[PDB]
Design a protein around this ligand. Sequence first.
Ligand code: 09P
Ligand code: 09P
Ligand code: 09P
Ligand code: 09P
Ligand code: 09P
Ligand code: NAG
Lengths: 203, 201, 209, 200, 203
Amino acid sequence: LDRADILYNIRQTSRPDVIPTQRDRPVAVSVSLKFINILEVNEITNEVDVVFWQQTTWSDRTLAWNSSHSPDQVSVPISSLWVPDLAAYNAISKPEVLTPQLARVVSDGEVLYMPSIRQRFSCDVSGVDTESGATCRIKIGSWTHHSREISVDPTDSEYFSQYSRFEILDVTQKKNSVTYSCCPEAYEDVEVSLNFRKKGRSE
Amino acid sequence: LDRADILYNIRQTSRPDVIPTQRDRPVAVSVSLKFINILEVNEITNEVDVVFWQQTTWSDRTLAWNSSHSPDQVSVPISSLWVPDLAAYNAISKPEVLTPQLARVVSDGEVLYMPSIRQRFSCDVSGVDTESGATCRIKIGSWTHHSREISVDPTSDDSEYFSQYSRFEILDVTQKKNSVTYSCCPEAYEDVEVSLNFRKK
Amino acid sequence: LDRADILYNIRQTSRPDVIPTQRDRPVAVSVSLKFINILEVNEITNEVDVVFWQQTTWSDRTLAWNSSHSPDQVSVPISSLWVPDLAAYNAISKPEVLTPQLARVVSDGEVLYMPSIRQRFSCDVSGVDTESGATCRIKIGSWTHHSREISVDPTTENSDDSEYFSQYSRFEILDVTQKKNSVTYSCCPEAYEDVEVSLNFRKKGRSEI
Amino acid sequence: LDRADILYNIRQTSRPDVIPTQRDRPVAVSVSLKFINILEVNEITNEVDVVFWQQTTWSDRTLAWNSSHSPDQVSVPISSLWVPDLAAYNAISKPEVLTPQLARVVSDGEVLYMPSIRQRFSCDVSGVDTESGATCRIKIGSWTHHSREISVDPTDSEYFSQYSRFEILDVTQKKNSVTYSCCPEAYEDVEVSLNFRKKG
Amino acid sequence: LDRADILYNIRQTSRPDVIPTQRDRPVAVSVSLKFINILEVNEITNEVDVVFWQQTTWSDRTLAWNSSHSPDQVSVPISSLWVPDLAAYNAISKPEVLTPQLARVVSDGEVLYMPSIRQRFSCDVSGVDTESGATCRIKIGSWTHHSREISVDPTTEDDSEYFSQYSRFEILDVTQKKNSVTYSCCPEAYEDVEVSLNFRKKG
Ligand SMILES: CCOc1cncc(N2CCCNCC2)c1
Ligand SMILES: CCOc1cncc(N2CCCNCC2)c1
Ligand SMILES: CCOc1cncc(N2CCCNCC2)c1
Ligand SMILES: CCOc1cncc(N2CCCNCC2)c1
Ligand SMILES: CCOc1cncc(N2CCCNCC2)c1
Ligand SMILES: *[C@@H]1O[C@H](CO)[C@@H](O)[C@H](O)[C@H]1NC(C)=O
């Protein structure tokens, strides 16, 4: 098996429309945000612009191949894969995807999709200009798949731009299960708390 | 039947172009707005930005399957389904759809489509900065299907999903159904009018 | 015949690329603007933002069907139909189409396409804040089909204009008049038809807005 | 032959990807700008917004048909035709195409494509608010085809909006052949000089 | 062979999804930015708008043909070719591609893709209005292919030969540099080119 063959088979048998549940257990999706930049904070309106890598991870056995005599990874256009229907509940603009829309697929069926995204959010910006900073919560989960079909779990400003007007004090993640008044089932989400503040001109 | 089979059948026998009338009867569409945020009010120009879930509900028996030993629901791309041609009459921008464009389909043919949308409207913003607030009316109906083909009806805490971080707060939401005859065309067209009473905090 | 059959036939045989001329005579296209809103006037730059329904009407026999025991109308995506290549000559932005892009088709082949459009125009805004108001002319015709292939004609309803106009606009409409022209450009030997819509409007008293 | 047949044949045998060179001669493309409006001048940043018809003209013999008892012209979506890969070198925004993207094709294979375009350019805006006005040069040529494959040649105030804040004093056109440090061949372009000024 | 045949063969067999590695050796990609304009500098927010030609170069043997009695080059839509998944790490907007999306292909399989791009970046704008100017670094590399699949290198071939004389700014110097980076998320190394643009406001 070479790359050409692997990619051909994947394209030929894809089913991007089919959630890869295994024996009616949920697809376990991991989500983690790597913050790159904070761009346009407004303490009056409670709005922020953020750039982040949305590290998204899951398993789709239908993509697996025997890599005994083959590459054990390929990069694949997401239009050829099933992908989780994640959305940020408190986003007030659609995601601006800054990077090539490719996922990495391992021979065992593990998938990693990690685009860089710029997006505007509605959240608590109060205190951004004090020492203890502001804490903005971002809520991400499956739009249409309940907890029996999709579960989401969480996995250092290492990637954060030194040229931002802001700095990161702390990031914490938390998992929730929510029942909305519209539907009888429960839906999982991850809440990411971003604690940040304006740098001093001197800093 | 598994999900793969159900989704394959749906895609293969699509008909996204065909309104699913069970004939002479109109497709009964339910519409309901869950307000999430109010973003950029202008009392001078009478314009507002709103974020809301557009809960849309209808029946399409051509999607039904026997779920005796199968899943009784799947998520489907709306490009593979017939979808009501709803529009907001007083919108002054096209809808910005913020969420994945999937509808939920039940084995009996019930469909739920509920995108989160950001959109700008022309409406009465006067009094927004007073105690009794402003009342902005949003009018939604089928663009091209008359009352014999599509009927729209209204379906809770008005603020249940509303953002606590908005500069505004919701005082009340009321819904109302209308049947309108336009000068251009002989038939009547239904719509729902949603009245959003809100004010600056 | 049911709706599914009618729509299937249309999709399978429609030639969206083919202007439906009958016997070397022009397709008669009717155009009419119903104004919904006037949004962002600038008297310095002579620019206006307008929202309007663009009522467009024509005949295409190739869509016809025998409706003896059938529906006599369906809604059809415009991607499955031939559509006139109308453009606004003095537009300075591309049309923002606000509504579902569907046309209504009658069993005899009559087609009605009427999207709501937001668009910016270059025109005479002078006098907008006076009693007699400004008069902005919008010019619409076929971009590439001459008068022997497409003719454009106004239609005046005999009803009041301001019927669909938003009461919440900062502006108000004094009058709307339509007029047909036939023009020959220096690039081309043939004549091209257009409709000129004259929108007479003014700013509402400032006590109200 | 009727229009339906002509259009069907064109669509079916369409090779939009193939430059229609005849016998190793370059495709001769004519370019001409008809200015409609000047919208948003900035003398500080040297930027202007312009609306113009981009009259583009060339020959593609593979489109020809016998028009003895047939129409001798049709309108065709440009997605079904080869089209020159022209670009404006000093544009700082992508072209906003305002009109239907249709070309006119004559039975002998002559093609005319003339969209109305709004676009922003980087150029010399100094003097715009003086009597002699500013002179803004727009440079247009094939992005990827050299002079042996494509040549560009020149062929307006008649179509200019009376409601613009600006007025046109003069338009001149000029053809150039240029080399670039990246490539050994020569590339043709047209430079259009727009001399304009702010009205009273 | 004529152009029509060459283009037909390429379209029919190209495999835009398949990275053209030759025996486990990485595809060698060359990247070089030719700056055309600097448009909208903001020293407060550390943001700049740049227009540049992104000269991108690589080899794909699967495109080769015998040109004995044929054209030895054609222009090809990039949708019919494999193309490197290059991204600018510090971009804060998606690339606005200003030119026709065509690549030039030589009969031996060499490809040149050079679009003009307008894009906004986050970088160090301090000193832009001084004599020594600001130095803005732009970082470009493969988003998903590691050093064993794609390597990126600067070309060894004027700082402003193509730069607009009508810009409010002027270029003092351009330097390029190659890096190999390991991120915390992944075990492999990823190559990039860092382009340093030293520029200042004209007097
Ligand atoms: C079976 C319910 O299907 C749905 C279809 N669209 C949206 C939702 N939402 C409510 C559930 C939680 N996610 C937010 C949107 C649910
Ligand atoms: C024959 C009626 O067909 C139509 C096609 N497009 C738009 C409309 N409208 C008028 C009916 C009510 N909705 C507004 C638009 C009607
Ligand atoms: C020779 C007819 O071909 C043409 C192709 N595109 C545009 C035009 N125009 C001139 C005729 C009138 N409409 C404006 C543009 C003509
Ligand atoms: C082998 C030359 O192929 C090319 C592929 N893309 C762009 C260019 N350019 C440089 C030559 C002149 N046009 C501007 C862009 C050249
Ligand atoms: C092999 C890991 O697959 C990946 C899929 N998408 C993005 C990345 N990134 C990490 C490597 C360097 N480029 C940034 C993004 C990695
Ligand atoms: C339509 O079909 C019916 C048969 O059901 C036929 O008898 C009738 O004459 C047809 N009408 C037209 C106008 O062709």
